[PDB]
Design a protein around this ligand. Sequence first.
Ligand SMILES: [Mg+2]
Ligand SMILES: [Zn+2]
Ligand SMILES: [Zn+2]
Lengths: 231, 62, 290, 193, 843, 105
Amino acid sequence: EPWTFDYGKIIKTAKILDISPAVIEAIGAMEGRSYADIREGQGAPPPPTSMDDPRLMAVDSAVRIFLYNYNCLRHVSTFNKPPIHVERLVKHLSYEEKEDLEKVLPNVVNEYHTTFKHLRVTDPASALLYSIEFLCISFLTLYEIKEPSWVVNIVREFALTELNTIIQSEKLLSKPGAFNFMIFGEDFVCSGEDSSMDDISAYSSPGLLDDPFSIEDVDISLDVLDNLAPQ
Amino acid sequence: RYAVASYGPTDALTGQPLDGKRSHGGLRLGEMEHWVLTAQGAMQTIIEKSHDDSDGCISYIC
Amino acid sequence: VAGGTNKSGIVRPQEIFSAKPVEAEQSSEMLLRLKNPEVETNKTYAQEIANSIELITFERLILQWHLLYETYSSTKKNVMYPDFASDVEWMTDFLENHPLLQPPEDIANWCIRLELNKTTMILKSISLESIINSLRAKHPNTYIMHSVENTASGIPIIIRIYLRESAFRRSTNTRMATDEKIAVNVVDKLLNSTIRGIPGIKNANVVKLMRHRVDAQGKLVRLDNIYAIKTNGTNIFGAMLDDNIDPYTIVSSSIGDTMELYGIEAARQKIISEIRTVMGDKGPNHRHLL
Amino acid sequence: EEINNRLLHGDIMPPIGLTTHDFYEKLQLNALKFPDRILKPIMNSINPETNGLFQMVATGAKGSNPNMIHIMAGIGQIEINTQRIQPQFSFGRTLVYYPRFALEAQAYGFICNSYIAGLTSPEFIFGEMNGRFDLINKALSTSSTGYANRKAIFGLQSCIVDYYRRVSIDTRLVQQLYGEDGLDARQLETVRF
Amino acid sequence: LRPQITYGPIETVDNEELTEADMLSFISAAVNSTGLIGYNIKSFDDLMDNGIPQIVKQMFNVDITYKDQRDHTEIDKLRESVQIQFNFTDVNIERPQHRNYSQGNKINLLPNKARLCGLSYSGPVNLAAEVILTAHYSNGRQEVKRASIPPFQVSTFPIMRGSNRCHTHHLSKTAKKEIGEDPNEPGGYFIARGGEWVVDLLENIRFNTLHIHYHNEIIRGEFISQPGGAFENSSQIIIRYMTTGAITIEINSTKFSKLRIPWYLIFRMFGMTGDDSIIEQVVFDLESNSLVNTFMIEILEKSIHVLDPIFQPVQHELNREKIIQFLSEKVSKFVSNPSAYKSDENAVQYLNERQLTILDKILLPHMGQTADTRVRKLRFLGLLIHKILLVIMNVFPPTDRDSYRTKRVHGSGVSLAKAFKAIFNTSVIAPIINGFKELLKQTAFEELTQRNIIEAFSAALSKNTASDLNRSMEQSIISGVSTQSLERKNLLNTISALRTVNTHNSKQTERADMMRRVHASYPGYICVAQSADTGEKVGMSKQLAITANVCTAGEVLSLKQRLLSDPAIQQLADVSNKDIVRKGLARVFINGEWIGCCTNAFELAQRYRMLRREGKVVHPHTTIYWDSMVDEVEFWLDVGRLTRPLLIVDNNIEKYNQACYKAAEARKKGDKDWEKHKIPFIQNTRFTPQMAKDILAGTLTLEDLVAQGICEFITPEEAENCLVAFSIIELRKHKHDVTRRFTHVDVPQAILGLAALVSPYANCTQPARVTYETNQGRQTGGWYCFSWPYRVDMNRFFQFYNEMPLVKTIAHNYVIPNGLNTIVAYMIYGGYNQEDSVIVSQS
Amino acid sequence: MKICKACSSCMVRTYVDGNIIFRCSCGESVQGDSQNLLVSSKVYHTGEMEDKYKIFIKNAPFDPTNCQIKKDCPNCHLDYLTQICIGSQKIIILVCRCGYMSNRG
Ligand SMILES: [Mg+2]
Ligand SMILES: [Zn+2]
Ligand SMILES: [Zn+2]
């Protein structure tokens, strides 16, 4: 099967969330940038060329937390108690239909992991687009569902909440704006480029009951130690 | 070489001579030498050296 | 200085003066005298007895072991590990070779697969038949299958031990142990089982020692052709139970072990003996050891 | 060398309780000891009636037989902790001067030369390995002995002979009679029965 | 690149005429090129010219924020914090100066005046800087004030005598002689408070290497990572395997401390949160059927499901952002109340960016300090865990704590730089921060001008700080960075004190005895005889061999770029973990960082060792180690490697093998005289007797012996790929021995130190007695100093008459003999010489 | 171990009514068929197994620090071989650069 990148899925997905397409395309590349620049798409890094680019892991991590949280809702019955991000909206449900939602909700993890590991080794540039596109099509799959009637309102809310948290988690790694520095609870506030408050003992080489060679129970004057010479 | 005196500089706290030739004090009859003198039975020698010559005094107890 | 014979800079005097227990002794030894005076004359008789008393635990005969979640039924084809699916070929031979050792009806879902070290089986002179009897005499709550004793290199000898349901009925009221925990506890018991020896001793040598004996004419003569056993590691009670060793003349090098089994008076004589050994011959008078 | 040849053909079968490595090391240590014949060339080179070095050793004034052999015949096998020079130089080499898995006895501390003839660089290094132990153990012979000496005295010093020749701790018997004979160590005579 | 030079055939080299006394010229050349303490002067020189400027201009950038604790004002009430930001731009150190009379012009201070007056032989340090102050208002805007400060003197740094900054460096030997200095001494000591102090060489574990030790912890693995250079900050990671089955990674550095983290949390924080990929970085393949991977995965599988009390909330989470936030609020020391900042989304972004900036700069910095190499570090981190698990399985033994393959010898430049870092930020950086804190408290930020800011910077660094910086360095030099007072018993002791390697200062009975012995890695680098013969210091002090040296850091970038440009080496980004174990690739290291893989480890090291011989491409001081046990190639160019020259031995094994093939081919054809096609084996060195005569004439040095491919420098870890003949006779004895093919030939005297070479016929003496002579020869009366009348010394003896021994050694070519040729009778005379006494003629 | 299909996490193995059931933290539950019937295993004498020295034995003919022996190689008829002695039983292996290796391996 020949895979081809589809830009139409990102445009459709971005329109639903009322956000710029550049925000979706910049998953994992938001570090060290202003979100206003990310929103406008200015300063976007070039496509990856190395299989060890942390962007590939960053996008893949965002994909698997969508899948991890989706399956938690899918298997809500098996839990002793559901986690926070899925319990407040399924609370009004009954047990027999809470034991359901694993038959009426389709699986969306069909062939992601196998293909991503192949694309990462073969061509890293296509792997980044594949992981982003997979996140959008999975969101559209969970947003374009229509039957049965009792599940549409419980999954579309989930789809928007998950994709928003993924974007927000990526957003919280960008360049911060302006804020009160004293809300942390202390006077001083250092940065990652500061050396004033570094540990003094850390400048030395890091790292390190009876002494067998110490004359501690031998009462001999320190000025007459030549009596211990081997001779 | 060293040989000092019947008297000389004295430690303020213990009342014993100072340490070694450098301070013009006495020489040490350490832990192992009281073991030997006790083994030999030399008890009047211990009185002469550890009391008369080092810090011996009179304590009054009710 | 090697392990089990550490007589380097002060250790043995520290073991005596600090009254360290037998578990903390790095150079414990023991001298055993054969019960029959005729046997002690011959070296070969003393040589085979010395090799008889040498702790060969079942662990040291094993190259590798595998714990499998399997039950064995003769007719029903139960699931088996794919890497060990070839074991069924010699299982059929075992069933037709032992018409009395049929699999029980309470075999649990736990299998221990063993691959014996054939080199150790040759150097230590341990047969497959001896191992099977030792394990079946000590572990009645297991069912054991084995392959054929082969003399051709490249084909290993496989020991297969099946845990019965009674292995968990021993103590399962203490629910703080899942069935995986008991099975791991059982395999530790199986590996630490004693085969052909007494516990506590790792090496047993043969030495020549000299003794006096009053003749029929009242003459005291030195007998030089007397063989005994000097062991590495100490177990007075272990050699106590042996029928090839004179129990009355067991000489340990452990003060704590002599104290435990003989008393404080024999421990008093043991401290004197052990200090004298450390003191050498240019040592103090005897009254200083008392 | 012929023990090594047996190893190459796999003709060394260790007994029960010994590995092949431990049995091979035992054979090499036994095979690398000077015989009693070593003094035959030594005594033929000296005049016992005029040799100063020999008269110092023979009369017990100073020295011993291994001293003359080391000076004149050869040092022999350097043996630390009753074993040969273990390989600490990169997995099977004792020194940089010998190859990995060397079979010759020289690679494991066998000094073929005497002091009067001089040692080579590898022999001097092996000699320094054993010589350093003497310096280390001499230093320990003070501190380690002092640790044990002080603990022994503080436990034993309370024992004093009373008027019954008993040994007691202020009331409490340690011995019914000192030494079980009541005698002094300085007043003993060695007598045959 | 492939080697191109070719030398003459080894069969035409005439060395049958050589003698052992001719090989002493090789030691002479090695000592002349090396000097005796030249490494000390070089280390202090590149500390002055290169070390301190780099440390100040790179590793002391200050960025802090402080609360505005003023009263009420229009601007005041509306602003909350001020950001102090500054860095140093220009740094230099001058020669020592002294003020003659009062209010003079800082005349020069000669070392003898410093010794006599009890002064300090310290040179001024001048620094320049730019400072930025940013004040933050409540509404959201901020105000920035920037000021450039003219260069000024902060304090004085101690100056080694004889170095580039010493006054006894622009003077002739006669001038040195006549100003109260010793014209024959090389120097290498510091003058402080009228005393002479020697900064000893320090043993230290090799950086960028994994040291695996056993010990509750089952096993432990340490790894100190330095991003390249002797003066860069180092961060260590400790990977522990506990009895509970949990693998924890702990990073000790200037920003973290004693915080043990589950191993998979580190992988998650870098974007790789999938467990299958995380496990793959340790086992290199999930599809391998090898019995090693079964052991590996079983430990890894159990380690994931172990509950960590401190990292409980984020153990089961797969969102990397919250894990970074969880760790950031745990390691940041300015966070006192949780959830007070979580309401503000900008504070969350601040702590996330700060933690990522810290982690990229502190976790394995030798692999890179940017965010690009995050996954690259994870591959290397998984390799470290893989090596540790191989020791738990008992596949490989733990690291030998005594071998010099994993040890470094650090001189005065490295030791003083380490002490400089901890003192500079305390006596300079801290007072400036206090000075600016008080400036902003007493004056509004907007009221400040360019004049006020510069005044506060210099006034804070008053002479309290100037006293602090200089005297703390002197305390580090005096207290001991292990240093000792220079006692001048004689010239031999002065040289031997500067060639002494000290160890760090355990109580373990076995550990305290093993480290005092002579190790198999000592011969050629550490004297096997020189040690203390009495007391606790027996074997605790070590002496460099006569030809041993200490190398400086090389130009690593040249070799790194060439290795990456080598078509035989595949870059790390072009190879997968599965492509490594399935194709059997060989990992290639340079200075401890993993840069790529090669299909043939032996051929790469062989081809680069041959390139080193020319010296035009690979520097002669480059260590090339090939690990035949794990099939890896390592390049080392860091400072602190002991090296000695070894004469290269060449043979004709290539022609010998072809003769064997031709002889066999002739026999298979039925020919009878098949043996006639064989040729004898010949191994020989290219050192000719003419070269020895040229060394003595001064027309042949060690540098151009290396340039001709005759001798090369060998490092203790590189010495493990060498088979060395102990003398030119052993090489000649095995000249036609094909079963013993040496790679180098040694000069026998190269294994002893300078003090151990004084004893004549030391090989004929009991080896323990050679150790005594090293101690006794260093406390011998003699001409203890050539400038004794100019010195006021305590407890010094100047023996009037000295004699060269009738049986001299090579050690007397470099130090003055101390003693007399007394006529000695070996006799019994009256019993007054018994028990190690002597009878002395009164005349 | 068993890796979850959904989230690629390490699934927890438990035992129910004569079957091995893997359950994940995301609720996904699967049952192993044949390859997951391996609770635990251990290998003894790991310090002298043949898989330990495979790389070292392969590299031995090219390492110049290994001990040589005067014996003819039966493959290339080279008159010297490389002799190595590995293990606690002192197993002797003769290797050559052409690929020959005693013990037939
Ligand atoms: Mg003396
Ligand atoms: Zn899962
Ligand atoms: Zn061949």
